[PDB]
């Protein structure tokens, strides 16, 4: 509810001291956006050389272990991606200490709607709600100034009728789907441009941030291109090349493709594993696989030349890469492939597509790495976080490729198993919504991570619906290996075929909390996201039955 620059000067005044400082910025959690945000944030701190702690939090339940344990001198705290949904004032408590409260916890979140207790009643925040939903948002505005603090019998009856009158519309709010408005990174950059830093790798961090989520919607991002492209116009390494030159040597616009790993993998394998194209061409089917080859017969690209790594393909095919696709792809309905994208060239190393980089980092997060076992695993993910954090750095590229050799493999897993599902037609159309469960599969170790099931769930909800009449219906998935029937189940959102009228607001967040409040059968919201929960095989089936009814949508 504040100016970004002024919130900045506040976090400046409470910061620098002897001993320095102290602030812990919480990077959270598994979302690439977090990295994108906190890296340019951390670089900004290093600019004024302000000491910082930075914590890799996984579990939402895990945050309590930290904040309740170690705090001493820390008067100014910062947090990322948490608290937009569940309020930490009740969750942490707080317990006001010393107006002009000593500690300011900044909470940065893209999630909506905000918790009601957060924005109004200033204690721990210093909210980041600005500027996306301001709004009004008159529904939260009347939620308090009316409620607080609230012949005489008719005035009591009138008063109470008014109270429930506000409580109904208030109940409409805060019970709702969790949907990201704008990427937190973008706003950190809006905060950053007011201070005056135009830095190139910074901007690349923004591009990374925005393009973190294009796998899932945009939704506003379709109109974020002005806010990026203009900035790309606010700077330039040289008016003209001047090949290369070995330095600056920076990012530029190119006809990029939702196509998967075009530059770091072989072309044919790049269609065959791509996510958008899995769908339209029915590639899980042997009968459709051929249709790809017909694409190549249309392009005049040899099959043998399609099998070869993209660095080494002939030059003629490169110069025709932006034409041939226009000549052909239009006929297959694949006409939405070509985006205007961002590509940063490091020169003699190669170039990297904005999206593919994100595929590298995601790749890093799950691989390349009774409560003791889950804690130890979540711990392994915590360590792995930094292995992924390092790849963002420019000076070490040598491990970034270790991401990509993984990002390929994962797909080779994911695709494979994905097909293993469609052969058995495991989809349960049900009535109100679509649902699935993986009872068996190869290498569930890869599927342990929330984000792995976010991407498999994504290629699957993308595959089932082209569309593909009728009625985009949200999907459900489940997997188990070890940790005694943890059976991780993540919520999902429907995918429109590039024509998106409504955000549609994932409802699993609410539907799960209704069940936690009913019989709560081995239901665990331990994962940071409201869409993803844990379950046991003993209680999963009654849970599934209680999921089927009553349907909130």
């Amino acid at each position: 509810i504040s100016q970004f620059s002024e919130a900045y000067n506040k976090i400046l005044r409470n910061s620098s001291s002897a001993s320095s400082c102290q602030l812990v910025i919480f990077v959270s959690c598994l979302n690439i956006d977090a990295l994108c945000a906190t890296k340019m944030l951390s670089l900004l701190f290093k600019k004024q050389l302000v000491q910082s702690q930075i914590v890799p939090i996984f579990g939402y339940s895990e945050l309590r272990r930290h904040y309740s344990q170690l705090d001493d001198n820390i008067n100014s705290l910062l947090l990322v991606g948490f608290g937009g949904v569940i309020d930490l004032e009740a969750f942490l408590e707080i317990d006001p200490q010393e107006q002009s409260f000593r500690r300011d916890i900044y909470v940065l979140d893209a999630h909506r709607p905000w918790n009601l207790d957060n924005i109004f009643g200033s204690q721990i925040i210093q909210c980041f709600d600005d500027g996306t939903v301001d709004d009004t948002l008159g529904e939260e505005k009347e939620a308090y100034y009316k409620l607080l603090e609230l012949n005489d019998l008719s005035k009591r009856k009138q008063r109470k009728k008014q109270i429930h009158e506000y409580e109904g519309v208030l109940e409409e709010y805060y019970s709702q789907g969790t949907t990201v408005v704008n990427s937190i990174s973008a706003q950190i950059y809006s905060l950053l441009s007011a201070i005056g830093e135009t830095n190139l790798s910074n901007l690349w961090l923004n591009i990374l941030g925005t393009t973190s989520l294009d796998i899932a919607y945009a939704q506003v991002y379709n109109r974020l291109y002005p806010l990026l492209q203009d900035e790309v116009k606010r700077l330039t390494p040289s008016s003209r090349n001047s090949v290369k030159t070995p330095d600056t040597l920076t990012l530029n616009i190119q006809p990029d493709y939702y196509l998967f790993l075009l530059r770091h993998s072989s072309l044919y394998d790049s269609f065959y594993y791509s996510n958008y194209v899995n769908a339209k061409l029915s590639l899980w089917n042997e009968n459709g696989k051929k249709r790809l080859h017909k694409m190549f017969a249309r392009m005049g690209i040899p099959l043998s030349t399609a099998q070869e790594t993209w660095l080494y393909m002939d030059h003629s095919i490169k110069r025709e890469l932006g034409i041939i696709f226009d000549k052909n792809l239009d006929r297959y309905g694949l006409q939405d492939i070509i985006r205007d994208g961002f590509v940063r060239t490091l020169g003699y190393r190669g170039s990297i597509s904005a999206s593919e980089f994100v595929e590298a980092l995601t790749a890093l997060l799950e691989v390349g790495n009774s409560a003791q076992k889950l804690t130890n695993l979540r711990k392994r993910w915590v360590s792995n976080f930094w292995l992924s954090w390092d790849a963002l750095d420019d000076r070490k590229v040598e491990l970034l490729n270790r991401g990509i050799q993984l990002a390929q493999d994962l797909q080779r897993a994911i695709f494979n198993t994905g097909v293993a599902i469609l052969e058995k037609k495991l989809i349960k159309h049900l009535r109100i919504y679509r649902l699935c469960v993986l009872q068996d599969g190869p290498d569930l170790d890869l599927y342990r991570n929330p984000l792995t099931l976010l991407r498999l769930g994504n290629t699957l909800i993308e595959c089932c619906a082209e569309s593909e009449d009728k009625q985009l219906l949200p999907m459900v998935l489940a997997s188990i290996d070890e940790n005694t029937d943890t059976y991780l189940v993540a919520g999902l959102t429907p995918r429109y075929p590039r024509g998106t009228k409504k955000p549609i607001l994932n409802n699993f967040s609410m539907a799960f909390q209704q069940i936690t409040a009913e019989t709560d059968a081995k239901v665990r919201i331990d994962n940071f996201e409201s869409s993803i929960i844990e379950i046991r095989r003993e209680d999963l089936s009654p849970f599934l039955e209680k999921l089927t009814l009553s349907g909130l949508l």
């Binding site: 080859h293 017969a297 249309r298 005049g300």
Partner: protein, 90 residues
């Protein structure tokens, strides 16, 4: 001979719009097959060629040599109209 060129004008007609088993041109589907497989062997049944005309079948039992060279260039023409490419393939 140049007269033989006119023969091509006939055999191309045999190459695409010829049908059998209630529609669904077979040789069109072979060209489509390679085609995708791009195995560069187009395959023509002698039964059908002899079914349309015995005059060409007689040319196969007299002088296959130069006639296959006349024929396969036209096959390349048919693949050319069906897939406006393979100037780069074979």
């Amino acid at each position: 001979p140049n007269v033989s060129r006119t023969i091509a004008r006939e055999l191309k007609s045999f190459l695409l719009e010829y049908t059998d088993e209630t529609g669904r041109s077979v040789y069109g589907a072979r060209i489509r097959t390679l085609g995708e497989m791009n195995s560069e062997s187009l395959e023509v049944n002698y039964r059908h060629l002899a079914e349309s005309k015995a005059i060409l079948a007689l040319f196969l039992a007299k002088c296959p040599e130069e006639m296959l060279k006349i024929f396969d260039l036209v096959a390349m023409e048919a693949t050319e109209l069906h897939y406006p490419d393979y100037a780069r393939i074979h």
